[PDB]
Structures are given as C-alpha cells and as structure tokens.
Amino acid sequence: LESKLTKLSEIQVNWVEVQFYWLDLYGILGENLDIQNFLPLETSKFKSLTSEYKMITTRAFQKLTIDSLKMIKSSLSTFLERQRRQFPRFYFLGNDDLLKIIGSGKHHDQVSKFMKKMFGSIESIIFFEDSITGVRSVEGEVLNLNEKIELKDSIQAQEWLNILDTEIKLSVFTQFRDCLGQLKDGTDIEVVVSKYIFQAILLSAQVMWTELVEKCLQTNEFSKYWKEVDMKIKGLLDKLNKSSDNVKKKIEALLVEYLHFNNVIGQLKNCSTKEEARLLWAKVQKFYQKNDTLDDLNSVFISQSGYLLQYKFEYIGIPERLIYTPLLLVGFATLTDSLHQKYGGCFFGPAGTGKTETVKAFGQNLGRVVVVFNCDDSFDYQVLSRLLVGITQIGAWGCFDEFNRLDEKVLSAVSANIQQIQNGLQVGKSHITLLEEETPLSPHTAVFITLNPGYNGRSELPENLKKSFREFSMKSPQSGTIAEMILQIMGFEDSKSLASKIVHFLELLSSKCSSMNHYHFGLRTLKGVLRNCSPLVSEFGEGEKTVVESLKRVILPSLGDTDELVFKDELSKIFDSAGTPLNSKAIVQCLKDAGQRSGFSMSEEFLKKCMQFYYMQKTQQALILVGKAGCGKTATWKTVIDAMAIFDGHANVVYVIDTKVLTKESLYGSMLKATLEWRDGLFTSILRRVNDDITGTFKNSRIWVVFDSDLDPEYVEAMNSVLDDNKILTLPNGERLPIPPNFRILFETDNLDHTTPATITRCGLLWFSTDVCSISSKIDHLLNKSYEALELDKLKDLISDSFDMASLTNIFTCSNDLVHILGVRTFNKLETAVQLAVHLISSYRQWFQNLDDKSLKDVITLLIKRSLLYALAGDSTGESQRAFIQTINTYFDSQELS
Amino acid sequence: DRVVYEDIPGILDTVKDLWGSQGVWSVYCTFLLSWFHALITARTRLVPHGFSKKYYFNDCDFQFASVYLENVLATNSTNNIPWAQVRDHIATIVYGGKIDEEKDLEVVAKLCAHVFCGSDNLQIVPGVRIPQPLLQQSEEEERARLTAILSNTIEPADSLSSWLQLPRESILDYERLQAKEVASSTEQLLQE
Amino acid sequence: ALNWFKNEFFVDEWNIADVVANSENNYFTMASERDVDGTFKLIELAKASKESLKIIPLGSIENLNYA
Ligand SMILES: Nc1ncnc2c1ncn2[C@@H]1O[C@H](COP(=O)(O)OP(=O)(O)OP(=O)(O)O)[C@@H](O)[C@H]1O
Numbered sequence A: 001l002e003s004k005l006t007k008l009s010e011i012q013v014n015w016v017e018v019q020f021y022w023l024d025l026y027g028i029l030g031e032n033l034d035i036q037n038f039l040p041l042e043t044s045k046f047k048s049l050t051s052e053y054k055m056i057t058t059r060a061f062q063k064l065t066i067d068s069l070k071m072i073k074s075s076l077s078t079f080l081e082r083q084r085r086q087f088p089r090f091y092f093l094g095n096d097d098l099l100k101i102i103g104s105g106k107h108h109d110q111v112s113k114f115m116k117k118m119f120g121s122i123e124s125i126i127f128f129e130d131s132i133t134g135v136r137s138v139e140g141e142v143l144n145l146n147e148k149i150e151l152k153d154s155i156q157a158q159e160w161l162n163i164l165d166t167e168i169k170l171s172v173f174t175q176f177r178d179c180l181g182q183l184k185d186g187t188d189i190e191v192v193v194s195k196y197i198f199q200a201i202l203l204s205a206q207v208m209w210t211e212l213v214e215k216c217l218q219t220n221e222f223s224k225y226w227k228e229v230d231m232k233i234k235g236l237l238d239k240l241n242k243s244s245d246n247v248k249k250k251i252e253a254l255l256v257e258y259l260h261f262n263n264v265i266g267q268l269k270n271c272s273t274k275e276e277a278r279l280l281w282a283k284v285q286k287f288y289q290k291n292d293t294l295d296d297l298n299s300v301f302i303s304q305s306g307y308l309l310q311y312k313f314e315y316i317g318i319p320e321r322l323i324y325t326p327l328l329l330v331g332f333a334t335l336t337d338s339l340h341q342k343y344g345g346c347f348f349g350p351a352g353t354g355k356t357e358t359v360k361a362f363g364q365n366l367g368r369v370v371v372v373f374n375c376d377d378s379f380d381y382q383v384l385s386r387l388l389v390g391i392t393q394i395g396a397w398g399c400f401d402e403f404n405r406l407d408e409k410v411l412s413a414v415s416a417n418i419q420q421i422q423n424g425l426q427v428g429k430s431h432i433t434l435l436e437e438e439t440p441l442s443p444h445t446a447v448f449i450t451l452n453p454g455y456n457g458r459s460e461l462p463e464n465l466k467k468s469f470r471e472f473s474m475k476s477p478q479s480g481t482i483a484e485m486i487l488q489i490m491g492f493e494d495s496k497s498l499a500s501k502i503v504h505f506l507e508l509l510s511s512k513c514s515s516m517n518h519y520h521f522g523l524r525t526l527k528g529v530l531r532n533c534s535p536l537v538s539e540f541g542e543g544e545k546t547v548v549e550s551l552k553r554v555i556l557p558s559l560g561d562t563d564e565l566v567f568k569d570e571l572s573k574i575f576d577s578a579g580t581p582l583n584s585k586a587i588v589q590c591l592k593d594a595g596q597r598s599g600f601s602m603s604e605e606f607l608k609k610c611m612q613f614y615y616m617q618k619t620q621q622a623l624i625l626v627g628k629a630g631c632g633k634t635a636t637w638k639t640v641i642d643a644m645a646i647f648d649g650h651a652n653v654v655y656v657i658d659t660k661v662l663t664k665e666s667l668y669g670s671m672l673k674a675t676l677e678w679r680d681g682l683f684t685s686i687l688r689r690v691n692d693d694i695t696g697t698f699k700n701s702r703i704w705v706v707f708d709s710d711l712d713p714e715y716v717e718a719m720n721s722v723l724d725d726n727k728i729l730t731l732p733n734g735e736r737l738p739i740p741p742n743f744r745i746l747f748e749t750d751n752l753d754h755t756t757p758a759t760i761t762r763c764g765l766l767w768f769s770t771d772v773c774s775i776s777s778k779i780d781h782l783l784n785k786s787y788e789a790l791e792l793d794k795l796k797d798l799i800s801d802s803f804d805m806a807s808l809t810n811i812f813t814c815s816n817d818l819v820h821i822l823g824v825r826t827f828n829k830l831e832t833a834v835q836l837a838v839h840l841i842s843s844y845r846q847w848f849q850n851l852d853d854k855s856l857k858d859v860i861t862l863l864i865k866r867s868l869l870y871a872l873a874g875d876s877t878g879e880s881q882r883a884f885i886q887t888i889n890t891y892f893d894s895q896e897l898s
Numbered sequence B: 001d002r003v004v005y006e007d008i009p010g011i012l013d014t015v016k017d018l019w020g021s022q023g024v025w026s027v028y029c030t031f032l033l034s035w036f037h038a039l040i041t042a043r044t045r046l047v048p049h050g051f052s053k054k055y056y057f058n059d060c061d062f063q064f065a066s067v068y069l070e071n072v073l074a075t076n077s078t079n080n081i082p083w084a085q086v087r088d089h090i091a092t093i094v095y096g097g098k099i100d101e102e103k104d105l106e107v108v109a110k111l112c113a114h115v116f117c118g119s120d121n122l123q124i125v126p127g128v129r130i131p132q133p134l135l136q137q138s139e140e141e142e143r144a145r146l147t148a149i150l151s152n153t154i155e156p157a158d159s160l161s162s163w164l165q166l167p168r169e170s171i172l173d174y175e176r177l178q179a180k181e182v183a184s185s186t187e188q189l190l191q192e
Numbered sequence C: 001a002l003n004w005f006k007n008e009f010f011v012d013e014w015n016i017a018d019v020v021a022n023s024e025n026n027y028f029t030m031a032s033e034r035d036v037d038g039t040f041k042l043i044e045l046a047k048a049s050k051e052s053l054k055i056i057p058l059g060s061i062e063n064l065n066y067a
C-alpha cells in the first residue's frame, strides 16, 4: 500500500496547507474587527470561503477551498500594499509572510521569527507574561528595553511594532548615555564591557577617544595618552582569554577599535609640525556630541573632514568589525563627502577588495544596519523602483551590490527615480511621487552602489546616471594591516612578522605560478586563511604551525601539478618549519567505510581529494569542484557525505540541481506581470522550505545543494549575496531569505573559461588535476556494481580473473592511436564495456548448466572480446574495427573472435 | 536641429567659461579652482603622457570642490586657511576619487600642489601672476580685478606644452598626428 | 596653424544658447560620445530662459507612457 500511503501523505500535506491558509484568512478577516468593511466584495467572498471551510471541516469530523483561497488572494493585494504602507519595514516581506504576521491576532509569536528579515540584526523577541522585555540580537547578545510594553488583546501588529522600533532607539541611547557617564566618572572599560551592550560601549569609547585626543591637541604632548591606550589594549587582551563567548566577541570588537585608536595616536605622535598634525586629525573620523540638544536621539554627530552626519541609534548587535586600513578611512571620507549633499556613494574596482563591507562598516559607524541588494537582469524598472520606494520609507541605507548586473534599459530608466530621491532629500521634500503614488520620504535614507567594471556580460552605467554618484577606486587594499591586526586579535605572539610573511608569501605565490584563469590570491583568500586558522588554535596553538596548516588547507586543493610543488617549495623557503599533520584517524576510517559501502577503492589520490574536500568545507560554506569530465567529483562528494553521516550522525539531504537545464525564471523565480505576485523558483523554494522548517528535522540535519552544470555567469552572480558572508538571498520582491549555517552549496563543473572572478574568490575551489581512480580499480568497482545490480560466485570469480591487468592495459594503450569520431577518452568508455559484458553473460547464463569448463571459459572470453571491441572501437570505421579486432586477438587458449 | 556637445579645447577659454558660469577669499578660491579644473581637463586629453588612460572630469567635481572650499572658508574663519588640508582633500577625494592608478594620483597631487600652494607671489603659468587678495577690498571689486587680470592674459601657441609643464616631444607628436589626420582628410575631401 | 583658418576667416562662433535662440525648429537633437553628458548645459539654459525642463529618460514601458 505504498501508493495509498503516498496519497494519504499528499492529502495530509494539502490539508495542512489549506488549514494554514484558512487560519491566515481568519486572522486577517475572520477574527479582527473593523476590517471586513474595507473591501465588501472580498468580505463576502471570505464569508463564502469560511462557510465552505466549515462545511468541509464538519464533513471531515463526521482542493476547492485552496483554489478559492488562491483566487481571492489576488483581491488581498491592495490591502497588503496598504498594510505595507502602514509599517514601512514590511516591504522586506512577501505576501505569505505578511498574511502570517497580520493573522497573529493573539499569539504574537510569529512576529519574533521575522525580526531578522524586517530589522537585520535582531533574531528573536523576549516575552514575559504577555509583555516584551527586550530584543535579542543575532550574535546572542541580549538587549533589555528601557521599559516594559504591555500588549492589548485587540491591538494591531503595526502599532506595537512602531512603538517597539522607537523603544529600541530610546533604550540604546539610554545605555550609551549611562555608559558614557560611567566612563566620564573615571572607571575602566574592563568593568563596563561586562555590563552593557556592544554598541553603547563602542560609541562611548569613540566619544571619549576623540575628546581626549582634542584635549591633547590643545597641547603638543602625545606620549602619556599613547602609553595609556597601550596599557588599555594589553588589559583587554588579557581579559580576552578568560571570558565567555559573548564577552569574547565584544572584547574582540573593542580591541579592534582600540587598536585603531592607538594607530591614530601613534601617527599623530610622529608629526614634525602642527599643521600636518591638524590635517591628519581632520582626515580621520571623529565622534562629537551636542551639549545643548533638547532631542535625545540627535545628540551625537560624526565629523570627518569638516562634514557632519547624524547618528541614528539603531540596534546593530555585535557585528564582525573591520580593520581600519588607510584605504578604508579614505573611503569613509569620500562617503561622507558624497552624503553631505545627499548623493550616492559609489565604489568601483576589482572583486574581493572590500567595497560592500566598507559600506556596511560605514553604516555601523553611523549606527544603522545597511540593507544590501543583489542586482540581476530580472530586476526590471518596476521591481527596482519598488525596492527604492521600500527603502525611502524606512530610511535605511540601500547598498545596491553588483550594480553592473542590471540591464542597461533599467539603468537608464531608474535615473529619474534616483534623481527624484536625491532632489527630495536635498530640498527637504516631505513626499515624493514614484509609480504614480505619493509616498513619504524619511530624511535618513541614502543609496550606495558597488559595481565591478571591466567584466564580461556586464552593462555600462550611462553618464546621466553616473553624474548622480561619486566613483571611488579601491584597486589596491592593504592586506598587511588587516593580517597584522587580526592575528594580534587572535592572540599570536609575533603578529607583525607572521603577517608580513603571510602577505609576502601570498604575493610570491601570485607572481611565481602558472598563470591560469582561477589562480586568484587577493584579500578573500587571506580572510579565509585567517578564518580557517581560528579553529586550529585549540589543537595547534598560536604559532607558525597553525598558519602553515591553514595555508595548506585553504590554498593547496586549488592547485595543479607543478603549482603545488612550487607552493611547497615557497612554504619551506619563507617559513621556518612545517608542522606535523593531523592524526585524522576517525575521519579516514569513516571515509574508507563509506567507500567500501559505496564500492569505490581508496587510492592515495582519491583519499587525498576527499580529505581536502572535508577540511575545506569544515569552514568554507560554498565550494566549487573543478576537474576533467568523468574525473570523480560526484563520487568524491557523495563518499564524503556518507562519511560525515557516519561520523557525526547528522542526516544528510542532497538537492542536486542542474543549472543550465532550467531557465532563471524557473530557478530563482519570476514576477508574474499579470497582477504582480511572486512565483517561487526552485532554489528559492528549497531555501524557503528549509527556512520555515515544517517537518522539524532540518535543525539537526545538514543540507547540501549541488549545482551540477557549468558556471554560467548570468546564473551564478545572481547569488553573490549568498556566496559571501552576507548569507542572504535578496529576491526581487524584497524577501531576504537568510542562509542557515548548515546550508552548503557545491558547484560541479568541468571548465572555468567563461566564469568571472566575482565567484571564484567567494568559493573554496577544488581542482582535479587528473583522474582519482586507476583503470583496473574502476573496472573492478564497475563489476562489483553490476553484480550488486542483480555457480554465480564461480562465474564472477572467473569473469574478474579474465580481466587480466597487463593485457587490458595493453589493449587500452593500443586503442589510443585510432582515429575516433566524437572524441572520448578510453577511461570513460569502460562503463559500456563492463555493463555490456555483464548483460551478455547474464543473458547466456541460462545454458551454462550443461557446458564443459573449457567451452564455457572460451565462450565467456569471446563475449568479453566482443564487448571490448564494441566499447573501445565502436565509433570507428570498418578498417579500424578490423585492425582492433586483430589487435585484441593478438593480445589475448582464448577463443578466436573474428 | 542637431548640436554636438564637446569639451572646450582652449585652456583660457575654459577658464573664461567657468568664470562666467559663476568673502573675497571665496572668490579667490573659486578662481584658483577654475584654473585647476581647466588645467586638469586640458591635461586629460594627452593619454600617453598627461595621464595613464582617458579620464572624464565634469561639472560635478567642480561643484563639489567649490562647496568644500566654501565650507572650509566658512568654518575655518580665523583667516589661517588650511591650504594643505584643501590640497589633500581635493587631490584625494573630490578630483582623485575617479582615479584608479597611482601615477595619475601623483600627477593630480603635483598639479594641486602647484595651483593651491598658497603663496603671495603665485605663478600658475609663466604669463599670468595672481597676487593674493588684500583684506580691504569688496566682492564686486575682487570679481572685477580677477576678470580684468584674466582678460589681459594672452594664450601662447605652445600652451599645450609650456602651460601644463610638459616636455615638448609628446605635445609635438600628438599635434603632429592630429594635424596629419585632419590634413589628409581635407586633402581627400578637397579633390572631389 | 590648424585653427588659424577659423581664427582669421570666420569672425563669429555659435554656442548652444545661440543655436537654441536662433532656430525656428521646436525640436533639437544633442549628441556626445560615451561617458560625457551635456544635460547640465540644457538645465542652465532653461534656468536662464526661465522655463521648466521635464527630464524623462527612456528605456521602460511605464516611462514611455509617461513620456
Ligand atoms: N575511487 C574510485 N573507485 C571506484 N570508482 C571510481 C572512483 N572514482 C571514480 N570512480 C568512477 O568514476 C566514474 C566517473 O566518475 P563520476 O561519476 O564521479 O563523474 P563526475 O565527477 O560526475 O563527472 P562529470 O560530471 O564530468 O560527468 C564513476 O562511474 C565512478 O564509479
């Protein structure tokens, strides 16, 4: 009754979906009062659907309803748009999530799950007997609100969401104010860092630093404050090793900021006169504070090179702070210069140079999270303008990542909208008119674009659009400062020399290797090396061994034949020693068990590739597998998946998707232009299914998505916000689907000629220089697989004995010189030979109970000869087939095959 | 009706156009800025030697430099004008934002150091000498004085070489190639 | 020597303001090479002549209907 069970499961799933839709309909119209009078025809249709659902429920207790609900879903679009206009942050949600959040009449718990989508840095909401106590950040930090907010039973979602939005700003300001007062009282930051949230401590420390630096500039002494900041840094580094995880993150971020403070003070100390000292002080970012402001939230303003910007006091949690390179400071300066006249800050340069992260760091320094969009050809004028009117109402800063990917027509069409937004911001217009709909304009909004010019399949910005932005170039980032500061944060003893050695070794590997199209060794690989070295400190310590092990595990699997020898020579030359490799006994045993149960044979190269893949994926989230056709990529990752399932016990689900078989509209999605609803694609559907977690097992299971096709750029840089550390999928309709930590993406391809650097650096690449399996091992495994697909033991033994290694290898080497149409390597054709021979023996086994051993062996040898002929020289002419049958006759007591 | 829009070739004509488009120190700073913009736009044309590639400086850069200059003059009103700070901001942020290479950044910094040097006996070009403003003059008188000292300037035949401070070989090569192209085209057109 | 002919023979030059002010045509077509624009020139001319420009870029069907 498997078919009956499947039908029952499908009916149960459909009934669950219909029940959820009916619950949403009851929440939006059937439960709330003074809400059916907005649309009378829709109210009557909802009443009829309610009557039909009640009749169906009574019949079940004693498809048409779902179809009716889907049909009346079109009539709810105007109400959903009005609801979005009520609370501006709802523009980052789809229609289904909007119904879910508006149908929560009294449960008030589905709102908490969406806080990452609406806000960006808030995960859940703390509840205490029907009262919100505070909001919880993504990184585990707990914020307690200034005062508790009571919830009414008949209250609406958007009103209490707005008062929570204002209460968060008020609470963050209160924590900043009393933290700054405590630091003004003369206490040390070591006792404050375990009391308040990270943002308040950071802002108070920056204000204190700029006040003390200006006081020191009123004189000409700098040594005392430099020594004091050095002692504070040493104390924070001492406190780092003896604290919990949240305090560890907070102390790491404050140590980054204090290292920047010490760098600025040291640069100011090395001045010769006072004019250059004042110039250098004006070049860096300052955090002043109003002294006579009657409004609390506008009491902190940021000054840099004479321009002033307002602090928004929005909760950001504990983000991954960035190392303040001089290029980053100049980028902040030009961003402030652009935003002084409400223009759009623009960054152009090669990939992996720190553009989107620089914009995000600027936003975090301005105390607001920056929503990032991933532009694509499917972003037509209506979708992009809807995103713009979504970000104008909220006031959040929009960073249109990969702005070149837009179609040129959309680029020219949105110029009027961008100019209108800029003019409304500059002239102080209360309302603007986009899409024939007057909308409010929050004065805090801004737009940024980060484009990567000079690439294949990328459009060019028209000059009438480029005049509304301010291009800044970041071709050359400072890897040395980033490496030094991060390694000092981690706790390495000799940070400066180790970072200089790392950077010099990276440049040596970039400049002294075979120039192939995927050897990209910029900043992303260095960041990956440091992130992989972070777990290694537990079992290798802070030293050279951790660095060389991380360099191996990150860089080595993406190298060829001579390049890995060059890398090993450089590693021995530039570093003092190479550490003892990991024991890795358990993972090797699990891999060998998985290969034994999968029929593969563990050679040296295949086991090396599997171990490299495992150690690469342990930190990296998205991987690209590159090699020849029929090299063993699928076998490698399937075997490693089975090994992981054996070792950890977590169940694995694999969702193999072929990229080029499907169009983009069927892969990610497509806006239905008939009446503007979002139809899910396939990858988006998988992501939403794993995010919602109806089944309840994806929390304790790994999810692997394989893109088993070529890397078409038009398909791959639609995911640039997914591959990088953003870990969100920015849909056209504003839906921000996050990427869970157990969601990994594998790319299975053969060539990288048409791909772009924007996706090679984002993934840990794995290169297959040659085949992972020998000929004889592959033949043995194929024979075992064909036998498993089915006296018999004696027949199998004699068949395996007939495949003599020397004769078979001689025949395979002799077959290479023939002229082949539709050229295939003889490695790939062995599957046909094995399957054909096994099927012929299986077909002729019915008369094998009454034959002598010699005759049986001769017949089986003849069938094997025929199968080898027709699977090796099958695509050749008659003369070549005659030459090959003569050759196989010579190279094998065997029965003659003519 | 058809109109083709192109940048003005003459340096002096560019200065006159930017002056006609537009505290006495604000007028002095915008005059020096107009001269700097004209010089850098003239140097932009020479691709092998003036820069490393083809750049495009438009009115937005001039507007931002003017706004930054008036903001620095307004805020730093103690008459001690931070010329080094203005030089760094203009050569790095405003006019140096679009610059991708490093040699072009160096030549922009050199041009800004020559133009915005902040010396009383300022000599931006071998012909025109601009004295700094006095503290006892009016805005209209200042504008009249600057227009008068701009009117008396005569552009020499080697303005593409002598005014931009460049060796004559590159200018001679570029002008020779352009003259050869236009003369060959008009020779082909004149016969028929 | 190249522009000596223009300097000597011709004693008049026409800019955008003159060609706009001295043309019977109600439609003008403006052209330039890539990565340069003269929209600010037309905005300045409209401001000096005390008129209103409706800047409408092309490329999309909604903007075409508005045009
Ligand atoms: N270590 C091994 N032991 C036994 N068989 C192996 C081994 N490695 C690879 N093979 C065999 O190699 C054959 C081809 O490899 P595989 O199926 O993994 O290709 P692939 O990476 O998916 O290639 P492509 O996607 O380019 O077609 C398979 O039939 C597999 O059984």
Ligand SMILES: Nc1ncnc2c1ncn2[C@@H]1O[C@H](COP(=O)(O)OP(=O)(O)O)[C@@H](O)[C@H]1O
Pocket: A321, A322, A323, A324, A325, A328, A350, A351, A352, A353, A354, A355, A356, A357, A358, A401, A402, A450, A452, A477, A482, A523, A524, A527, A720, A724, A725
């Ligand atoms: N202090 C830093 N400065 C610059 N970049 C950094 C720093 N720390 C980390 N990075 C890395 O820089 C990368 C920025 O990516 P980016 O090049 O902006 O992407 P895109 O080109 O798509 O905008 C991040 O992946 C991050 O790992």
Ligand SMILES: [Mg+2]
Pocket: A355, A356, A401, A402, A450, A720
């Ligand atoms: Mg980016």
